[PDB]
Amino acid sequence: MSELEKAVVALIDVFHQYSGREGDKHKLKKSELKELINNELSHFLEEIKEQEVVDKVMETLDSNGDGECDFQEFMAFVAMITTACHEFF
Amino acid sequence: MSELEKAVVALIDVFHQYSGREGDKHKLKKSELKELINNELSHFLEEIKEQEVVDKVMETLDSNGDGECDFQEFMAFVAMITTACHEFF
Amino acid sequence: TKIDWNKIL
Amino acid sequence: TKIDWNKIL
Ligand SMILES: [Ca+2]
Ligand SMILES: [Ca+2]
Ligand SMILES: [Ca+2]
Ligand SMILES: [Ca+2]
């Protein structure tokens, strides 16, 4: 596998590591999303320590309004992050 | 960096490896897109050997109609690929 | 992992 | 690589 293919696999792997913890196994609830960000995105995003920030991030990502972040909505988040990284080069 | 962060970086790296070859350095023209797919996505997609397929893939990905695939449109392609990989598990 | 082109295009 | 939260939210 190429670096791009490895990246594709890592996206799938990390989403499901967190989404499968509790409740719906195919979606991230607030606590699963918070832990994903805090543990896995610490070089790109400040640690989330406040409920209001958890709530706002979920509200931002939950495009379909069901209160959880599904895989499509997670991919849109990843695109936001990758796009923002352009500021650094 | 986490596996997710490494994946973010790899996405950026591969896009720009190909987009920077010719013309606009921030977009993939047809030939750059074809080579990216053929070299970097060979485990997920059949090799492109026909102009019609190059043309259809570009038409599919070029959401803004400018004839090239920009970074946003590339991220949407990556989301298509990652989503389709769910068939395999 | 072969994804059929028709599911992309 | 710190991305300001305000550019996400
Ligand atoms: Ca869950
Ligand atoms: Ca949702
Ligand atoms: Ca180019
Ligand atoms: Ca375009």
Side-chain angles (χ1 to χ4, degrees), chain A residues 2-5 7-24 26-28 30-45 47-55 57-86 88-89, chain B residues 2-5 7-24 26-28 30-45 47-55 57-86 88-89, chain C residues 1 3-6 8-9, chain D residues 1 3-6 8-9:
Chain A
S2 68
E3 295 300 312
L4 176 54
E5 286 166 333
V8 161
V9 169
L11 299 174
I12 295 167
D13 195 1
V14 73
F15 174 83
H16 283 99
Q17 281 161 12
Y18 286 85
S19 68
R21 293 177 170 195
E22 292 177 32
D24 192 320
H26 288 91
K27 304 180 189 170
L28 301 164
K30 283 175 182 178
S31 61
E32 291 169 333
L33 177 62
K34 177 185 178 181
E35 301 296 0
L36 184 154
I37 292 168
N38 288 174
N39 297 333
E40 312 303 339
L41 291 165
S42 72
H43 304 273
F44 294 139
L45 298 167
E47 187 183 350
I48 299 174
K49 297 177 173 192
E50 293 105 43
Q51 187 69 56
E52 57 189 280
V53 175
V54 175
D55 292 347
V57 177
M58 179 67 80
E59 179 186 351
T60 299
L61 303 183
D62 176 31
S63 293
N64 82 335
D66 69 5
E68 302 208 25
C69 182
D70 63 28
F71 187 70
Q72 285 316 118
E73 290 163 342
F74 176 71
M75 287 302 307
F77 183 43
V78 172
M80 289 167 167
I81 294 163
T82 74
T83 302
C85 290
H86 288 245
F88 314 116
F89 56 88
Chain B
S2 68
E3 295 300 312
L4 176 54
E5 286 166 333
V8 161
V9 169
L11 299 174
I12 295 167
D13 195 1
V14 73
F15 174 83
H16 283 99
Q17 281 161 12
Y18 286 85
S19 68
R21 293 177 170 195
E22 292 177 32
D24 192 320
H26 288 91
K27 304 180 189 170
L28 301 164
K30 283 175 182 178
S31 61
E32 291 169 333
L33 177 62
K34 177 185 178 181
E35 301 296 0
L36 184 154
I37 292 168
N38 288 174
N39 297 333
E40 312 303 339
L41 291 165
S42 72
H43 304 273
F44 294 139
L45 298 167
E47 187 183 350
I48 299 174
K49 297 177 173 192
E50 293 105 43
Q51 187 69 56
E52 57 189 280
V53 175
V54 175
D55 292 347
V57 177
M58 179 67 80
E59 179 186 351
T60 299
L61 303 183
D62 176 31
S63 293
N64 82 335
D66 69 5
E68 302 208 25
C69 182
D70 63 28
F71 187 70
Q72 285 316 118
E73 290 163 342
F74 176 71
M75 287 302 307
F77 183 43
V78 172
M80 289 167 167
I81 294 163
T82 74
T83 302
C85 290
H86 288 245
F88 314 116
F89 56 88
Chain C
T1 162
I3 304 160
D4 299 323
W5 271 116
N6 300 279
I8 299 291
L9 306 175
Chain D
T1 162
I3 304 160
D4 299 323
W5 271 116
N6 300 279
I8 299 291
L9 306 175

